[PDB]
Amino acid sequence: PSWPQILGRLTDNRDLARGQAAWAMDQIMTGNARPAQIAAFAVAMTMKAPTADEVGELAGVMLSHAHPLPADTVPDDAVDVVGTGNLSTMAAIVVAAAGVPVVKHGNRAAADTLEALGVRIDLGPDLVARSLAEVGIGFCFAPRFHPSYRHAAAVRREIGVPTVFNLLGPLTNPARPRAGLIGCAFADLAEVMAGVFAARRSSVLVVHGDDGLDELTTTTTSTIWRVAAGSVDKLTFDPAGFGFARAQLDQLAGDAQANAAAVRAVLGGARGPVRDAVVLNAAGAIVAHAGLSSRAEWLPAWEEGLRRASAAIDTGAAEQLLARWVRFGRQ
Amino acid sequence: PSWPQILGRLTDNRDLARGQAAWAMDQIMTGNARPAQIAAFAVAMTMKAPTADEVGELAGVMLSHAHPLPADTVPDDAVDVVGTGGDTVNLSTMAAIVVAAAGVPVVKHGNRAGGADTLEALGVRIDLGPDLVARSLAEVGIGFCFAPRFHPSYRHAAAVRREIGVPTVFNLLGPLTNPARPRAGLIGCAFADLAEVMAGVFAARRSSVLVVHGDDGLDELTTTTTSTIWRVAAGSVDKLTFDPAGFGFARAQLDQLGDAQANAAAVRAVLGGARGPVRDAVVLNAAGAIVAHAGLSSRAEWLPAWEEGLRRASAAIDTGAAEQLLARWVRFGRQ
Ligand SMILES: O=C(O)c1ccccc1Nc1ccc(OCCCCCP(=O)(O)O)cc1C(=O)O
Ligand SMILES: O=C(O)c1ccccc1Nc1ccc(OCCCCCP(=O)(O)O)cc1C(=O)O
């Protein structure tokens, strides 16, 4: 195993042999990888087009180096709501208010919204565990939990272009949720992620908006990879089938203060395209959550998930869970 | 112009816009490119498959950053003999000595790893400044440009090469950035599509060059099989198939063609008159460079040019002129 061997293989457009991706990630996590080698690998793998086995090794090794949460502090039915690259933050809160444990994993952009809302996002494992137990939701700040990734994070900024590493966020949640709604901006890489979750024995909905969104929207149809029990089902999803009005991407589009205001409005009951998108993804995460204890029918599962997501807002539960989340950090 | 744009375009398998490659390389040549950005650029363009225009822009920038030789020290008809590397430093090194001994000025360009290593094993002083390389050309008829000495600004790229350790588009720059700027030569490449790219760059320069690709992976004309030759001259490129058998050369084996000291011994044997596959390959490539040299001042017929090139190359060995030139080369550095 060497960088010449692995990189040479990728630049010949060949899939890696077993363990090679894992070796590369280990060199990164130990700090032995040079920036040039990280970049070469990220770019070469991306242009080659990564496989689930390769992504599974990258995410697997990285996750094993992450700060774990304390033993028995994360429910077995905890879920994630996230995309690879607004709505996922809101959806996470709603799902939590519906009675589903949610544990997110994120970073500040070049998480910011949660800070603008007064949430203390940068907490250690013990307090994230307490947050999950007392508020019903927790947030793992990525730099806090993945410090060994910092050189790769720097590389990713310096090159600026999306690479295979942009798939690692949803696959390296330190709390190791077994369920969730996972959004991917590219159909090619969406199926790859579904394969990784499949091997993990996760129950997730890997979603890809046919408009290029990394989450279920009301702008157009979406492709969903239904992952459960090690199997993947590819489906098409039309929100219109659930009486949702179509919208434009302009409405689902700002700064932290603006995003924070959007959150309070939606949680405050404000109707519109933004709310609809939040309810869709929240429902998706709930349907994924149900996929742990059962394998119910697609339509009626979504009917139930949409009902719970909607009620979580309209009860004031979501708005009040947020308030409790802010009060938690203050005390 | 920025890295996210250029790298974005490349990873999308799109050719760059005019000027972008040059911008990228200059950022690299000025220490303004992060190692990650250098590696990302080199790898991305490699897998995209570089164009002659892109490589030409890279080579143009790198060459403009290089130290020149003094004015009026490099003859107009100086040649280079080199391969971009196999997947053959013994062959090219010997061919260069033979060509010089034939009366054709030769100026080489290489580094330690290796091209320069074999010469050091032979006792040649490789790391000389412009004025001494100039003296070597005039007094010995051959000169060597030590790549780190003449391309100091390439140090950031050179470090990245080592760290990734895989061939990239950058490996094409050597023959295209010879700081003596020979207008002719024999240039080898282990891959056909990259050979065609380099031929395109030499064409744009109006150079007289044979770009060669052994159909067995050799970055030089081989005896083991046929070769493709891009005959570059007068801004145009003829793509030709080449069979040494047509000149009476026996079909050798690749195994018949590793340390610098081992290569150094092979040089002394061949230049000493030892016959075999290696001699044949040396004479072929040397003859090729002489054909290229002829293309500077005339459009000669292909076969007669080669026959004359083979005649002179063989003579340069048989008379002992090649062996003696090496000796003078060594002595020159000792003094
Ligand atoms: O930059 C640092 O120097 C640093 C220092 C201490 C700890 C962490 C540090 N950097 C990071 C480490 C992990 C990370 O994120 C881990 C990858 C998962 C993030 C999810 P994303 O792909 O959506 O951003 C990001 C950074 C960073 O600089 O931003
Ligand atoms: O190797 C160095 O030590 C070096 C130091 C400072 C600046 C540049 C350095 N290396 C190079 C200089 C020019 C170059 O390109 C032109 C010469 C190409 C020589 C190819 P060869 O090794 O097969 O002869 C390549 C390198 C390099 O190490 O990659």
XYZ file of C-alpha atoms and ligand atoms in Angstrom:
724
model
C 0.000 0.000 0.000
C 1.395 3.355 -1.119
C 0.310 6.711 -2.526
C 1.909 6.026 -5.929
C 0.120 2.673 -6.110
C -3.292 4.001 -5.065
C -3.139 7.267 -7.025
C -1.710 5.496 -10.065
C -4.664 3.136 -9.935
C -7.208 5.977 -9.737
C -5.649 7.974 -12.583
C -5.957 4.848 -14.732
C -9.704 4.979 -13.962
C -9.589 1.745 -11.952
C -11.576 0.964 -8.811
C -9.367 0.504 -5.759
C -8.581 -2.878 -4.260
C -10.051 -3.689 -0.854
C -8.354 -1.771 1.943
C -6.683 0.813 -0.291
C -9.261 3.543 0.307
C -9.112 2.664 4.006
C -5.332 2.970 3.996
C -5.550 6.385 2.363
C -8.043 7.648 4.931
C -5.895 6.283 7.769
C -2.876 8.192 6.441
C -5.106 11.277 6.580
C -6.466 10.579 10.071
C -2.970 10.001 11.472
C -1.656 13.213 9.912
C 0.865 11.419 7.711
C -0.874 12.286 4.446
C 0.598 15.314 2.671
C -1.855 17.955 1.382
C -0.797 17.113 -2.182
C -1.675 13.449 -1.643
C -5.075 14.253 -0.124
C -5.938 16.505 -3.058
C -4.674 14.052 -5.670
C -6.748 11.287 -4.080
C -9.914 13.352 -3.723
C -9.737 14.583 -7.305
C -8.682 11.265 -8.833
C -11.422 9.341 -7.052
C -14.053 11.920 -8.055
C -13.179 11.825 -11.750
C -12.923 8.044 -11.628
C -16.390 8.044 -9.957
C -16.310 6.505 -6.465
C -17.879 3.163 -5.520
C -19.872 2.355 -2.372
C -17.045 0.064 -1.194
C -14.571 2.938 -1.500
C -16.840 5.491 0.180
C -17.659 2.869 2.819
C -13.967 2.475 3.620
C -13.360 6.236 3.684
C -16.333 6.965 5.948
C -15.729 3.868 8.055
C -12.131 4.695 8.947
C -12.920 8.383 9.514
C -15.836 7.561 11.799
C -13.664 5.242 13.920
C -11.353 8.177 14.685
C -14.252 10.434 15.683
C -15.024 11.394 19.260
C -17.707 8.914 20.290
C -20.720 9.784 22.428
C -20.803 8.174 25.902
C -22.036 4.577 26.129
C -25.798 4.055 25.913
C -26.595 7.768 25.487
C -27.844 7.517 21.894
C -31.169 5.723 21.345
C -31.052 2.892 18.803
C -33.741 4.735 16.808
C -31.977 8.108 16.599
C -32.182 9.689 13.134
C -30.220 12.122 10.997
C -31.538 14.758 8.614
C -28.846 16.092 6.310
C -27.724 16.763 2.749
C -24.326 16.708 1.048
C -24.713 20.242 -0.307
C -32.066 25.876 5.373
C -34.539 23.018 5.227
C -32.569 20.165 6.800
C -32.021 22.243 9.936
C -35.727 23.002 10.215
C -36.691 19.428 9.310
C -34.384 18.073 12.008
C -36.157 20.187 14.630
C -39.597 19.085 13.412
C -38.649 15.390 13.456
C -37.359 15.846 17.007
C -40.652 17.488 17.985
C -42.507 14.503 16.508
C -40.885 12.355 19.208
C -38.053 10.954 17.098
C -34.551 11.348 18.556
C -32.477 13.472 16.175
C -28.721 13.922 16.202
C -27.196 16.150 13.546
C -23.624 16.586 12.344
C -22.474 19.826 10.743
C -20.053 22.710 10.375
C -19.906 26.465 9.758
C -20.021 27.591 6.118
C -17.430 29.739 4.332
C -24.732 25.362 12.074
C -24.405 29.131 11.626
C -28.200 29.390 11.599
C -28.487 27.436 14.853
C -26.033 29.872 16.426
C -28.090 32.798 15.126
C -31.058 31.156 16.862
C -29.063 31.115 20.096
C -28.249 27.401 20.075
C -24.863 26.407 21.491
C -23.643 24.188 18.648
C -20.058 23.609 19.825
C -20.479 21.116 22.670
C -18.484 18.063 23.692
C -19.803 14.457 23.624
C -21.163 14.543 27.185
C -23.289 17.659 26.660
C -24.495 16.556 23.222
C -25.604 13.364 24.953
C -27.376 15.391 27.644
C -28.956 17.574 24.955
C -30.315 14.540 23.132
C -31.710 13.123 26.381
C -33.277 16.332 27.738
C -34.196 18.294 24.600
C -34.676 15.310 22.283
C -32.109 16.666 19.834
C -28.328 17.015 19.664
C -25.803 18.604 17.315
C -22.259 17.317 16.764
C -19.995 20.189 15.669
C -17.741 18.550 13.080
C -14.436 20.276 13.949
C -14.999 19.231 17.581
C -15.640 15.581 16.653
C -13.371 15.156 13.583
C -10.182 17.080 14.450
C -8.012 14.586 12.547
C -9.867 15.624 9.375
C -8.640 19.232 9.582
C -5.965 18.921 6.892
C -8.447 17.321 4.497
C -10.894 20.108 5.382
C -8.215 22.656 4.472
C -7.478 20.853 1.200
C -11.185 20.840 0.300
C -11.320 24.612 0.785
C -8.160 25.285 -1.219
C -9.381 23.386 -4.288
C -12.949 24.628 -3.878
C -14.482 22.015 -6.171
C -16.840 19.313 -4.907
C -15.153 15.923 -4.531
C -15.894 12.458 -3.153
C -15.199 13.857 0.331
C -18.451 15.853 0.118
C -20.237 12.527 0.712
C -18.603 11.953 4.096
C -20.671 14.350 6.215
C -23.862 12.225 6.251
C -21.760 9.048 6.595
C -19.584 10.183 9.512
C -22.213 11.238 12.056
C -20.394 10.576 15.368
C -23.625 9.469 17.061
C -23.930 6.746 14.407
C -27.671 7.036 13.817
C -29.209 3.954 12.203
C -31.841 5.993 10.343
C -32.392 9.287 8.596
C -33.148 11.412 5.577
C -29.992 11.775 3.489
C -29.844 14.254 0.611
C -27.421 14.116 -2.320
C -26.921 16.754 -5.014
C -25.968 14.210 -7.710
C -27.867 11.100 -8.806
C -24.654 9.212 -9.537
C -23.366 9.682 -5.997
C -26.811 9.262 -4.408
C -26.969 5.572 -5.277
C -23.397 5.188 -4.008
C -24.382 6.583 -0.606
C -27.401 4.261 -0.508
C -25.005 1.345 -0.915
C -22.943 2.456 2.067
C -26.020 2.804 4.277
C -27.194 -0.595 3.027
C -24.053 -2.335 4.283
C -24.443 -0.477 7.583
C -27.853 -2.125 7.987
C -29.308 1.390 8.200
C -32.883 2.343 7.356
C -32.653 5.577 5.376
C -34.164 7.461 2.466
C -31.371 8.687 0.220
C -33.062 11.473 -1.727
C -32.143 13.411 -4.855
C -34.278 16.267 -6.125
C -34.647 16.043 -9.895
C -34.013 19.808 -9.915
C -30.549 19.304 -8.409
C -31.537 19.894 -4.781
C -29.901 17.785 -2.060
C -33.267 17.257 -0.359
C -36.941 16.644 -1.143
C -38.513 19.851 -2.455
C -41.793 20.939 -3.998
C -40.021 22.321 -7.071
C -40.112 19.037 -8.985
C -40.034 15.253 -8.646
C -37.360 13.444 -6.644
C -35.589 10.098 -6.825
C -35.548 8.194 -3.532
C -33.354 5.211 -2.701
C -35.197 3.357 0.050
C -32.554 1.573 2.131
C -33.470 -1.076 4.698
C -32.341 -4.521 5.845
C -29.367 -4.309 3.491
C -31.506 -3.759 0.387
C -32.016 -0.666 -1.764
C -35.238 0.226 -3.602
C -35.107 2.982 -6.219
C -38.346 4.963 -6.431
C -39.656 8.209 -7.891
C -41.344 10.692 -5.571
C -43.905 13.296 -6.591
C -45.038 15.678 -3.811
C -48.060 16.545 -5.960
C -49.293 13.039 -5.171
C -49.807 14.293 -1.613
C -51.610 17.476 -2.615
C -48.562 19.718 -2.283
C -48.483 22.836 -4.446
C -45.483 23.215 -6.747
C -42.973 25.999 -6.104
C -39.849 27.605 -7.561
C -36.248 27.334 -6.363
C -36.240 31.101 -5.775
C -38.580 30.625 -2.811
C -36.492 27.850 -1.222
C -33.359 30.016 -1.365
C -29.603 33.961 2.646
C -27.481 35.074 5.600
C -27.658 33.650 9.127
C -30.053 36.295 10.470
C -32.304 35.826 7.444
C -32.190 32.037 7.792
C -32.969 32.305 11.505
C -36.010 34.449 10.684
C -37.150 31.852 8.155
C -36.928 29.160 10.840
C -39.077 31.072 13.343
C -41.717 31.742 10.678
C -42.030 28.097 9.614
C -42.028 26.845 13.206
C -44.513 29.631 13.928
C -46.937 28.020 11.477
C -46.285 30.141 8.383
C -47.703 28.444 5.291
C -45.865 28.386 1.974
C -43.298 26.501 -0.148
C -40.657 26.553 2.610
C -42.953 24.872 5.151
C -43.958 22.267 2.561
C -40.325 21.385 1.865
C -39.629 21.073 5.594
C -42.631 18.788 6.124
C -41.623 16.626 3.158
C -38.108 15.961 4.405
C -39.208 15.616 8.027
C -41.803 13.081 6.923
C -39.121 11.278 4.945
C -36.931 11.041 8.029
C -39.916 9.693 9.965
C -40.691 7.100 7.279
C -37.031 6.118 7.565
C -37.395 5.909 11.362
C -40.404 3.599 10.979
C -38.236 1.423 8.736
C -36.406 0.165 11.839
C -39.302 -1.502 13.627
C -41.301 -2.421 10.525
C -41.573 -2.516 6.730
C -44.931 -0.810 6.198
C -46.403 0.211 2.845
C -44.756 3.143 1.065
C -47.835 5.349 0.670
C -49.400 4.909 4.144
C -45.993 5.315 5.793
C -45.643 8.674 4.057
C -49.212 9.570 5.014
C -48.292 8.942 8.650
C -44.952 10.755 8.386
C -46.560 13.768 6.745
C -49.215 13.808 9.473
C -46.659 13.686 12.295
C -44.371 16.271 10.694
C -47.314 18.626 10.151
C -48.593 18.201 13.698
C -45.110 18.729 15.126
C -45.263 22.256 13.730
C -48.964 22.980 14.221
C -48.950 21.824 17.864
C -46.224 24.336 18.647
C -44.056 21.346 19.597
C -41.274 22.216 17.139
C -41.250 25.910 18.040
C -41.153 24.977 21.720
C -38.481 22.308 21.288
C -36.282 24.998 19.752
C -36.878 27.242 22.777
C -35.955 24.382 25.102
C -32.837 23.794 22.985
C -31.742 27.406 23.435
C -32.523 27.337 27.164
C -30.461 24.145 27.451
C -27.291 25.889 26.290
C -27.999 28.872 28.538
C -28.028 26.596 31.601
C -9.513 33.253 -13.369
C -9.368 31.133 -10.210
C -8.683 27.623 -8.938
C -12.321 26.667 -8.340
C -13.108 27.580 -11.960
C -10.136 25.832 -13.556
C -10.333 22.740 -11.352
C -14.102 22.730 -11.765
C -13.746 22.758 -15.539
C -11.139 19.992 -15.508
C -13.024 17.661 -13.145
C -15.999 18.124 -15.490
C -13.784 16.670 -18.245
C -13.881 19.962 -20.157
C -10.904 21.481 -21.965
C -9.705 24.753 -20.445
C -10.313 28.168 -21.975
C -7.344 29.899 -23.613
C -5.130 31.429 -20.916
C -6.344 29.347 -17.970
C -3.549 26.766 -18.112
C -0.984 29.570 -18.355
C -2.557 31.333 -15.377
C -2.546 28.110 -13.362
C 1.102 27.385 -14.157
C 2.262 30.905 -13.343
C 0.527 30.689 -9.958
C 2.536 27.495 -9.499
C 5.789 29.073 -10.758
C 5.413 32.001 -8.317
C 4.704 30.039 -5.138
C 1.113 31.302 -5.121
C -0.355 27.813 -5.566
C -1.035 25.668 -2.502
C 0.359 22.114 -2.795
C -3.233 20.857 -2.806
C -3.970 23.135 -5.755
C -0.863 21.997 -7.638
C -1.693 18.327 -7.106
C -5.377 18.854 -7.927
C -4.433 20.652 -11.153
C -1.890 18.087 -12.324
C -4.112 15.088 -11.588
C -7.305 16.650 -12.950
C -5.749 17.631 -16.277
C -4.051 14.237 -16.587
C -7.323 12.329 -16.213
C -9.184 14.837 -18.381
C -6.485 14.228 -21.050
C -4.412 17.351 -21.830
C -4.403 19.178 -25.168
C -1.434 20.570 -27.074
C -2.751 24.073 -26.390
C -2.880 23.426 -22.650
C 0.557 21.789 -22.433
C 1.938 24.510 -24.699
C 0.705 27.113 -22.216
C 2.230 25.206 -19.309
C 5.577 24.811 -21.104
C 5.575 28.434 -22.259
C 5.187 29.745 -18.722
C 7.730 27.338 -17.219
C 10.249 28.135 -19.945
C 9.826 31.891 -19.436
C 10.620 31.330 -15.736
C 13.825 29.446 -16.534
C 17.388 30.758 -16.533
C 18.591 31.199 -20.126
C 22.016 30.459 -21.548
C 24.105 33.493 -22.502
C 23.277 35.109 -25.856
C 24.884 33.464 -28.898
C 26.147 30.358 -27.106
C 23.586 27.839 -28.347
C 24.033 27.015 -32.048
C 20.941 27.372 -34.244
C 21.115 23.654 -35.054
C 21.420 22.280 -31.509
C 19.305 19.194 -30.754
C 17.859 17.344 -27.783
C 17.587 13.584 -27.291
C 15.248 12.473 -24.523
C 12.229 10.428 -23.499
C 9.492 11.479 -21.079
C 10.011 8.173 -19.250
C 8.901 4.568 -19.564
C 6.038 2.808 -17.784
C 15.359 4.321 -21.291
C 17.852 6.832 -19.860
C 20.551 4.437 -21.024
C 19.367 4.737 -24.626
C 18.848 8.503 -24.713
C 22.097 9.249 -22.903
C 24.090 7.118 -25.336
C 22.211 8.447 -28.364
C 23.012 12.005 -27.281
C 26.745 11.269 -27.067
C 26.682 9.585 -30.482
C 24.816 12.507 -32.075
C 27.319 14.988 -30.620
C 30.198 12.865 -31.930
C 28.535 12.987 -35.364
C 29.106 16.750 -35.417
C 25.634 17.826 -34.298
C 25.483 20.111 -31.244
C 23.592 18.467 -28.378
C 22.189 20.108 -25.280
C 20.373 17.879 -22.806
C 18.118 18.678 -19.887
C 17.485 16.402 -16.923
C 17.545 15.723 -13.211
C 18.576 13.215 -10.550
C 16.026 10.716 -9.253
C 17.342 9.320 -13.952
C 18.981 11.127 -16.856
C 21.586 13.054 -14.898
C 22.485 10.084 -12.693
C 23.964 7.961 -15.466
C 26.148 10.897 -16.515
C 27.383 11.405 -12.951
C 28.186 7.696 -12.772
C 30.256 8.219 -15.935
C 32.144 11.066 -14.242
C 30.431 13.955 -16.014
C 29.882 17.084 -13.931
C 26.169 17.714 -14.369
C 25.348 20.758 -12.189
C 26.843 23.685 -14.118
C 25.644 27.254 -14.539
C 24.679 28.840 -17.903
C 28.178 30.098 -18.774
C 29.790 26.711 -18.148
C 27.075 24.862 -20.074
C 27.814 27.382 -22.816
C 31.533 26.563 -22.594
C 30.796 22.833 -22.655
C 28.813 23.191 -25.888
C 31.589 25.144 -27.596
C 34.508 23.007 -26.349
C 32.975 19.523 -26.120
C 30.071 19.869 -28.542
C 27.628 18.741 -25.871
C 26.048 20.288 -22.788
C 23.750 19.348 -19.930
C 21.222 21.659 -18.262
C 20.620 20.498 -14.689
C 16.891 20.978 -14.263
C 16.869 22.291 -10.669
C 19.597 24.793 -11.534
C 17.722 26.253 -14.497
C 14.151 25.861 -13.171
C 14.406 27.142 -9.573
C 10.810 28.420 -9.548
C 9.562 24.925 -10.348
C 10.480 23.774 -6.821
C 6.895 23.837 -5.559
C 5.705 21.660 -8.452
C 8.754 19.410 -8.103
C 7.899 18.717 -4.462
C 4.328 17.794 -5.394
C 5.550 15.401 -8.111
C 7.430 13.396 -5.506
C 4.572 13.305 -3.008
C 1.991 11.906 -5.442
C 4.667 9.937 -7.293
C 2.468 9.186 -10.307
C 3.082 10.372 -13.875
C 1.078 13.490 -14.740
C 0.935 16.071 -17.514
C 3.948 17.670 -15.802
C 6.101 14.743 -16.969
C 5.673 16.118 -20.500
C 7.387 19.402 -19.666
C 11.037 18.309 -19.770
C 11.444 18.079 -23.569
C 9.293 21.205 -23.878
C 11.263 23.309 -21.378
C 14.884 22.615 -22.325
C 16.335 25.985 -21.236
C 18.843 25.981 -24.130
C 15.821 25.956 -26.462
C 17.098 23.573 -29.134
C 14.929 23.890 -32.247
C 15.296 20.207 -33.113
C 15.587 16.767 -31.550
C 14.333 13.250 -30.913
C 11.602 13.129 -28.258
C 10.181 9.898 -26.861
C 6.943 9.189 -25.019
C 5.513 5.983 -23.534
C 1.939 6.879 -24.529
C 0.681 7.645 -28.027
C -1.936 10.262 -27.162
C 0.579 12.210 -25.078
C 3.154 11.892 -27.850
C 0.653 13.481 -30.227
C 0.123 16.304 -27.735
C 3.845 17.064 -27.495
C 4.122 16.917 -31.290
C 1.428 19.594 -31.420
C 3.465 21.860 -29.150
C 6.651 21.475 -31.211
C 4.613 22.157 -34.341
C 3.341 25.438 -32.901
C 6.981 26.355 -32.234
C 7.995 25.495 -35.803
C 10.533 23.031 -34.390
C 12.059 20.179 -36.391
C 11.467 17.132 -34.234
C 10.685 13.452 -34.359
C 8.300 12.505 -31.569
C 8.517 8.739 -31.138
C 6.421 6.101 -29.419
C 7.430 2.452 -29.340
C 4.367 0.242 -29.707
C 5.602 -1.693 -26.663
C 5.680 1.158 -24.136
C 9.193 2.422 -24.840
C 9.790 6.179 -24.732
C 12.288 5.789 -27.559
C 12.570 4.034 -30.918
C 12.750 0.296 -30.202
C 13.976 -2.829 -32.006
C 11.454 -5.076 -30.263
C 8.696 -3.862 -32.581
C 7.385 -1.033 -34.768
C 7.040 2.584 -33.650
C 4.832 5.547 -34.431
C 6.719 8.688 -35.412
C 5.288 12.188 -35.528
C 7.552 13.990 -37.998
C 7.246 17.636 -36.982
C 8.566 20.217 -39.441
C 7.520 23.601 -40.851
C 4.587 23.815 -38.435
C 3.136 20.546 -39.778
C 2.986 16.963 -38.503
C 3.243 13.731 -40.485
C 2.138 10.651 -38.526
C 4.222 7.694 -39.683
C 4.681 4.031 -38.823
C 8.309 2.976 -38.394
C 9.857 -0.487 -38.619
C 13.598 -0.867 -37.926
C 13.454 -4.200 -39.772
C 13.248 -2.162 -42.972
C 16.810 -1.054 -42.209
C 18.031 -4.571 -41.454
C 17.783 -4.355 -37.669
C 16.971 -7.667 -35.973
C 13.924 -7.905 -33.707
C 15.166 -7.737 -30.109
C 13.339 -8.303 -26.807
C 12.306 -5.695 -24.225
C 14.177 -7.506 -21.449
C 17.349 -6.879 -23.474
C 16.840 -3.154 -22.808
C 19.146 -0.791 -13.852
C 21.262 1.273 -11.475
C 23.154 4.303 -12.780
C 26.396 2.348 -12.348
C 24.833 -0.518 -14.290
C 23.787 1.948 -16.983
C 27.263 3.505 -16.878
C 28.775 0.123 -17.695
C 26.317 -0.291 -20.564
C 27.445 3.048 -21.982
C 31.122 2.056 -21.986
C 30.334 -1.279 -23.621
C 28.219 0.215 -26.415
C 30.527 3.178 -27.044
C 33.390 0.680 -26.904
C 31.973 -1.171 -29.901
C 29.914 -3.954 -28.300
C 27.219 -5.228 -30.665
C 23.672 -6.237 -29.739
C 20.118 -4.913 -29.161
C 21.284 -1.910 -27.128
C 23.691 -0.650 -29.800
C 20.937 -1.027 -32.403
C 18.529 1.041 -30.317
C 21.173 3.705 -29.692
C 21.993 4.029 -33.391
C 18.271 4.188 -34.243
C 17.517 7.040 -31.871
C 20.748 8.826 -32.706
C 19.922 8.529 -36.402
C 16.440 9.827 -35.617
C 17.860 12.947 -33.985
C 20.121 13.499 -36.996
C 17.101 13.244 -39.325
C 15.372 15.849 -37.160
C 18.520 17.980 -37.294
C 18.424 17.810 -41.103
C 14.804 18.988 -41.046
C 15.986 22.394 -39.836
C 17.447 23.344 -43.236
C 15.842 20.970 -45.752
C 12.829 18.751 -46.447
C 14.697 15.555 -47.314
C 13.101 12.284 -48.357
C 12.245 10.107 -45.362
C 14.295 7.004 -46.183
C 17.392 8.726 -47.594
C 17.418 11.008 -44.534
C 17.306 7.972 -42.264
C 19.977 6.159 -44.269
C 22.282 9.162 -43.937
C 21.436 9.461 -40.235
C 22.212 5.787 -39.631
C 25.461 6.167 -41.577
C 26.667 9.065 -39.442
C 25.458 7.542 -36.163
C 27.190 4.225 -36.873
C 30.351 6.068 -37.930
C 30.354 8.137 -34.734
C 30.655 4.880 -32.794
C 32.908 2.841 -35.108
C 35.566 5.557 -35.349
C 35.641 5.776 -31.561
C 34.525 9.399 -31.856
C 31.652 8.839 -29.402
C 33.870 7.183 -26.806
C 36.395 9.996 -27.171
C 33.734 12.693 -26.882
C 32.586 11.234 -23.571
C 36.208 11.216 -22.406
C 36.527 14.887 -23.370
C 33.225 15.568 -21.640
C 34.505 14.001 -18.414
C 37.881 15.742 -18.688
C 36.140 19.062 -19.300
C 34.417 18.858 -15.926
C 37.543 17.733 -14.074
C 39.387 20.813 -15.312
O -9.219 23.830 10.615
C -8.794 23.419 11.728
O -7.632 23.895 11.905
C -9.337 22.604 12.727
C -8.804 22.687 14.023
C -9.322 21.891 15.051
C -10.379 21.010 14.787
C -10.907 20.927 13.505
C -10.387 21.728 12.450
N -10.911 21.661 11.085
C -12.019 20.827 10.676
C -12.189 19.491 11.105
C -13.289 18.737 10.664
C -14.214 19.309 9.753
O -15.359 18.652 9.252
C -15.310 17.233 9.170
C -15.977 16.853 7.819
C -17.480 16.773 7.969
C -18.111 18.171 7.843
C -19.491 18.080 7.164
P -19.467 19.051 5.608
O -18.779 18.245 4.525
O -20.889 19.364 5.190
O -18.715 20.349 5.826
C -14.032 20.631 9.323
C -12.958 21.377 9.763
C -12.829 22.660 9.289
O -11.835 23.435 9.189
O -13.822 23.249 8.808
O 14.308 17.914 -8.151
C 14.640 19.016 -7.641
O 15.485 18.790 -6.723
C 14.261 20.335 -7.892
C 14.653 21.354 -7.010
C 14.272 22.674 -7.264
C 13.496 22.979 -8.393
C 13.102 21.968 -9.264
C 13.492 20.626 -9.015
N 13.106 19.521 -9.881
C 12.631 19.636 -11.236
C 13.046 20.646 -12.124
C 12.544 20.669 -13.436
C 11.635 19.665 -13.875
O 11.108 19.641 -15.184
C 12.120 19.737 -16.196
C 13.155 18.577 -16.107
C 12.476 17.232 -16.241
C 13.504 16.129 -15.934
C 12.892 14.735 -16.172
P 14.124 13.438 -15.747
O 14.317 13.386 -14.245
O 13.629 12.094 -16.236
O 15.451 13.756 -16.403
C 11.237 18.657 -12.985
C 11.729 18.635 -11.692
C 11.311 17.634 -10.845
O 11.840 17.093 -9.830
O 10.196 17.092 -11.031
